[PDB]
Amino acid sequence: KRNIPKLDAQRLISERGLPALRHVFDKAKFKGKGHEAEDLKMLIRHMEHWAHRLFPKLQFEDFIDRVEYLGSKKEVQTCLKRIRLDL
């Protein structure tokens, strides 16, 4: 009972979170100079999809507003500096 998900640092360091975000763009491709709008649309599409898979409850902009604050916490920050470079 009361199995409500929360989206705290444990969610963000789960498999679907930053470990997934490190890899989602392996399939992606971009056109580069003079087509930054199309590349931006692909970029937001990929990370919007990643956000939806991570925590479906929120809209994408609200998810960004949550996560941009939530990154300050120490657990997700330590996992960030692990994801940056490598373990």
Binding site: N3, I4, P5, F55, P56, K57
Partner: peptide, 8 residues
């Protein structure tokens, strides 16, 4: 759907 409270 239920565990992620996805509203599907």
């Amino acid at each position: 759907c239920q565990t992620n409270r996805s509203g599907g």
